[PDB]
Amino acid sequence: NKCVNFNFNGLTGTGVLTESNKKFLPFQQFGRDIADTTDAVRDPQTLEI
Amino acid sequence: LDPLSETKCTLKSFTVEKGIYQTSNFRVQPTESIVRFPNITNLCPFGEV
Amino acid sequence: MTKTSVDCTMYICGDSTECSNLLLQYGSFCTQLNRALTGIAVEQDKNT
Amino acid sequence: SIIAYTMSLGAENSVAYSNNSIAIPTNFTISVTTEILPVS
Amino acid sequence: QEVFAQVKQIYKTPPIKDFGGFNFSQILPDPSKPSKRSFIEDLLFNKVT
Amino acid sequence: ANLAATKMSECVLGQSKRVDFCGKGYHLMSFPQSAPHGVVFLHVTYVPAQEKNFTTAPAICHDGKAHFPREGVFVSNGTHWFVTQRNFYEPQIITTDNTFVSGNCDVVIGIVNNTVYDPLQPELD
Amino acid sequence: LLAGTITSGWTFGAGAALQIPFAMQMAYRFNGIGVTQNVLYENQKLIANQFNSAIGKIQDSLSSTPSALGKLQDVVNQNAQALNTLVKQLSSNFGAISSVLNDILSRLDPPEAEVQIDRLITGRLQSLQTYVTQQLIRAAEIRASANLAATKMSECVLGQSKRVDFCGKGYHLMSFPQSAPHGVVFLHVTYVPA
Numbered sequence A: 001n002k003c004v005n006f007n008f009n010g011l012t013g014t015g016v017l018t019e020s021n022k023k024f025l026p027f028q029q030f031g032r033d034i035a036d037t038t039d040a041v042r043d044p045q046t047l048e049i
Numbered sequence B: 001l002d003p004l005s006e007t008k009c010t011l012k013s014f015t016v017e018k019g020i021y022q023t024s025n026f027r028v029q030p031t032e033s034i035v036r037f038p039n040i041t042n043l044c045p046f047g048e049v
Numbered sequence C: 001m002t003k004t005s006v007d008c009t010m011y012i013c014g015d016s017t018e019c020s021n022l023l024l025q026y027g028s029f030c031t032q033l034n035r036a037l038t039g040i041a042v043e044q045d046k047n048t
Numbered sequence D: 001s002i003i004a005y006t007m008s009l010g011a012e013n014s015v016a017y018s019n020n021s022i023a024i025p026t027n028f029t030i031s032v033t034t035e036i037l038p039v040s
Numbered sequence E: 001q002e003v004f005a006q007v008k009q010i011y012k013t014p015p016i017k018d019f020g021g022f023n024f025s026q027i028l029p030d031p032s033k034p035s036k037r038s039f040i041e042d043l044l045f046n047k048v049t
Numbered sequence F: 001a002n003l004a005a006t007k008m009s010e011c012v013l014g015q016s017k018r019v020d021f022c023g024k025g026y027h028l029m030s031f032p033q034s035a036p037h038g039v040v041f042l043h044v045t046y047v048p049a050q051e052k053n054f055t056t057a058p059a060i061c062h063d064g065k066a067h068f069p070r071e072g073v074f075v076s077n078g079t080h081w082f083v084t085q086r087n088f089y090e091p092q093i094i095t096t097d098n099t100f101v102s103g104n105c106d107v108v109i110g111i112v113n114n115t116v117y118d119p120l121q122p123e124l125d
Numbered sequence G: 001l002l003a004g005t006i007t008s009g010w011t012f013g014a015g016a017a018l019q020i021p022f023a024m025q026m027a028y029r030f031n032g033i034g035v036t037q038n039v040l041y042e043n044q045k046l047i048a049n050q051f052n053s054a055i056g057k058i059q060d061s062l063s064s065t066p067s068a069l070g071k072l073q074d075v076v077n078q079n080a081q082a083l084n085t086l087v088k089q090l091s092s093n094f095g096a097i098s099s100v101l102n103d104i105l106s107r108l109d110p111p112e113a114e115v116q117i118d119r120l121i122t123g124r125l126q127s128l129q130t131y132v133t134q135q136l137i138r139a140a141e142i143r144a145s146a147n148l149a150a151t152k153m154s155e156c157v158l159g160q161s162k163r164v165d166f167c168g169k170g171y172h173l174m175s176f177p178q179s180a181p182h183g184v185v186f187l188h189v190t191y192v193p194a
């Protein structure tokens, strides 16, 4: 819940993250909204969406 | 593979309205490249060399 | 009015496979310029 | 000072419809208006 | 404004729809307030997305 | 512009039963004048006022017959009945002239039994 | 706009609202088409059970039949379509090592990092001017729909219009409106000899 500049496993971006009910697949890394922009992130060190 | 799908991903639908649509273009492919220069009849003096 | 319909990859490039390999990264302008031309051919018929 | 308000459409008025009710005027009145339109 | 907003005074309709025999209800408002809209209207809003 | 060309071909040069095309109100005329880079149209019109509540009944009964009007409507003050036009009050006595007859007067709804002066009988007297 | 069409007939577009019982009203809207007043009063119910059956038939159309609200959608589709077309072009390098800026800076030194960007620009602005010129026009057209409608409500709804094929098919009696998301849908009632 803060505007931030982040790097997730080499993926770098800025924005505000939030806890999300989304269900990735055990291998999937990051979802992209239409326009293929970064949509969300499963956080590595706990692998949470 | 089949053209009913040559469209589908053009429109990006797994359904196709009644009606028509347009996908691609036809254009024949060529062959038998040709070159026919003029009568080669003005030569250099090599035998005289 | 007379309906025209165009094959961009034919005009900009003229059957030089080299070219089209450049237009892909100049984007999707190629399509639109057609879509706006079909959207005419559909109406200039409707008008009649 | 300043104000911020929702928009008033007009004066809420009600009419006396009835199977036996009409209304007719008795004196006329003229109006003059302006419809400005561009040409050039 | 040029289309729907011709008038300046907002009228209403009485409860007594003894309007000569017709049943205009299918257009008049719905006091149940499905957004104060009418029947032949609401369809036009849900039948479109 | 064309729209502004139509008005000086419809509203100025003539009368048009259309509303909100030659101004607000029942059109009567339209005097135009100029501009630097446009036109102006001065619309003269007809704005009703000084209303009055009346009571209606479309048709009338007499001799068991039903008579209707020709141009205008039927109204009544409390006891009398009169006929007049739809956009002005200048009432008249009902006659066999300003009306006409079709059918029996058992079907029309909202009717009100009345009498009819007829301008021939005394001319026989 | 309807609370006076029914009630005030059509006197609500020339000044004050003069009432009428909607029977004397249709009794006039017939006097325009060329029907004598009898044909209404003496055939009212048959005229009534028609008007009321006339709507349900429309219910099905707009309640059961899709494809009946096309044009209003062919407007939505485009405006949103070209939009994504603008969102999308932002991943077309337009002639550079990428379509992503922060990287291009984070990989080079200014000099080329400036021309790289000097190209990316030269297509975006071209991307925008394109969308725009596709958004003016489609916003001009929609006007002709409006200055038209504004001339339909002004005539068909607020009154009677003798114009054949303006308030629809037939000697027009009275046109009733209803609204919509981005537009209107009219209910034009007419006369049809049989």
Ligand SMILES: *[C@@H]1O[C@H](CO)[C@@H](O)[C@H](O)[C@H]1NC(C)=O
Binding pocket: D019, D020, E018, F109, F110, F111
């Ligand atoms: C008129 O309406 C009243 C209700 O206000 C009703 O009692 C009466 O029967 C109606 N009569 C006619 C002729 O419309």
